[PDB]
Design an enzyme around this catalytic site. Structure first.
Site, PDB file in Angstrom:
ATOM      1  N   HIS A 118       4.307 -12.396  -5.827  1.00  0.00           N
ATOM      2  CA  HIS A 118       3.155 -12.207  -5.601  1.00  0.00           C
ATOM      3  C   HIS A 118       2.504 -10.880  -6.305  1.00  0.00           C
ATOM      4  CE1 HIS A 118       3.780  -8.805  -2.957  1.00  0.00           C
ATOM      5  NE2 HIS A 118       4.977  -9.002  -2.744  1.00  0.00           N
ATOM      6  N   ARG A 178       0.519 -13.863   0.533  1.00  0.00           N
ATOM      7  CA  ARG A 178       0.361 -13.130  -0.401  1.00  0.00           C
ATOM      8  C   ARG A 178       0.891 -13.933  -1.585  1.00  0.00           C
ATOM      9  NH1 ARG A 178       3.232  -9.531   2.985  1.00  0.00           N
ATOM     10  NH2 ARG A 178       5.295  -9.190   2.526  1.00  0.00           N
ATOM     11  N   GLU A 230       9.604 -12.326   2.342  1.00  0.00           N
ATOM     12  CA  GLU A 230       9.954 -10.849   1.994  1.00  0.00           C
ATOM     13  C   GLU A 230      11.243 -10.279   2.824  1.00  0.00           C
ATOM     14  OE1 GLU A 230      10.912  -8.256   0.472  1.00  0.00           O
ATOM     15  OE2 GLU A 230       8.818  -8.084  -0.494  1.00  0.00           O
ATOM     16  N   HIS A 253       8.700 -13.313  -3.266  1.00  0.00           N
ATOM     17  CA  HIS A 253       8.440 -11.972  -3.172  1.00  0.00           C
ATOM     18  C   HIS A 253       9.742 -11.219  -3.839  1.00  0.00           C
ATOM     19  CE1 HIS A 253       5.833 -12.486   0.258  1.00  0.00           C
ATOM     20  NE2 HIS A 253       6.661 -13.555   0.211  1.00  0.00           N
TER      21      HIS A 253
END
Ligand SMILES: [Cl-]
Lengths: 233, 234
Positions: free
Chosen positions: B10, B61, B88, B185
């Site tokens: 991202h 994101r 993440e 991520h």
């Protein structure tokens, strides 16, 4: 009592909604985008939550959906795309305005194609600008030779849309999942026709507003408890 | 080669700017993050890449990065599959803190130890943490078991939950011949790279993937890279 929400996309680019945009992959115009923003906002204020989303494989609908999920902060939702929620395939008429249409096909054929529920438009000819654009787009690569439409009456669209509703959406609803469908006038028309048990006449007469969340309250047999409701002002 | 696989981290989040630990906090892109994703997508377009399916986290994101890429390459019609397994790393009690607050509270030693260890988790995010309800009581994690819901993760933990998804949902797609795009991520992607290249724990901590840049793998019949990862852009 199950809650179901539908939303039709708004204005497409280059006046295409008034030119049988059909299966041409037109984007929203900035105005149609803004309309989706208002719809999103309306849903945000009423505090609606969903568990799963359905949409077509056409970008105007998909963008409408993205806009809504963004507005309601539910971008993490599962999303399912399907050609079965697509707009009508307007065949050879695709891209044409009323006049162009009549000039190409005559007043007779034309008025027939307008007044009818089960008479298809003529299919795309090899010289039509959208020919390979649509008929060879890999997004339909999985479709059978007899499944890939070239032209659809309202009845055809509704016929290829209903089984998806039956096989894929109805199960989510019975399990209690709150469903948002972002789609097109005619496919949404399929669904509304099934839900309220309307006639051909009735369904052809009904124009679903654009950019406005349409709410249904459904009983245990998935039948509407009330007329359809709109969100906004 | 045999198979093409593209990964992308991202773009810059709004908290990345503030240097705040996000972890499972659902920070959105910054405008610069957005332009990063837009550029990555433009690069993927200029090279003529076509995908068949998309994997992403349940964090906006990553999701927004994905949307921007699909807009750029004109492939908004693709199937998209979200999973928390690509989220993440869960940064536990450090969530919502900046590097200053972190240093101030724990000491530079400890923060070093943390970001240099593969196996050591941050303190757990406890019920009186300012972001406890925000993350743990979020309905998007309702179907998680008690064991699955982290209060915090080491890289090893994050990797441990990411790989089963890779094995179970992505590998079958690649071996079917489907061209896969994974928008996720740094740390979950690290899991994937570490698996692909068989890197060491030491030689995965030192590995830093930039936000917003398409990464290309050409794999073979054993899903092993034939060549090192190529960055895509200018
Ligand atoms: Cl999506």
């Amino acid at each position: 009592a199950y809650k179901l929400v539908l939303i039709r996309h708004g204005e497409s680019a280059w006046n295409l909604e008034n030119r049988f945009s059909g299966w041409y992959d037109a984007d929203l115009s900035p105005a149609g985008h803004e309309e989706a923003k208002r719809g999103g906002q309306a849903l945000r204020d009423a505090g609606y939550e969903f568990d799963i989303c359905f949409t077509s494989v056409q970008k105007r609908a998909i963008r409408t959906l993205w806009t809504v999920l963004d507005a309601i902060d539910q971008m993490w939702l599962p999303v399912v795309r399907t050609w079965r929620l697509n707009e009508r395939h307007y065949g050879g008429l695709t891209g044409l305005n009323k006049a162009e249409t009549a000039a190409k096909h005559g007043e007779a054929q034309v008025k027939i194609w307008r007044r009818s529920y089960d008479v298809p438009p003529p299919p795309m000819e090899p010289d039509h600008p959208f020919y390979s654009n649509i008929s060879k787009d890999r997004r339909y690569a999985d479709l059978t030779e007899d499944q890939l439409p070239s032209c659809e009456s309202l009845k055809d669209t509704i016929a290829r849309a209903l089984p998806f509703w039956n096989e894929e959406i109805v199960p989510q609803i019975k399990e209690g999942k709150r469903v948002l469908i972002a789609a097109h006038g005619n496919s949404l028309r399929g669904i509304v026709k099934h839900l309220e048990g309307l006639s051909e006449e009735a369904i052809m007469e009904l124009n679903l507003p654009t950019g406005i969340p349409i709410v249904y309250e459904l009983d245990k047999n998935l039948k509407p408890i009330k007329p359809m409701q709109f969100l906004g002002d």
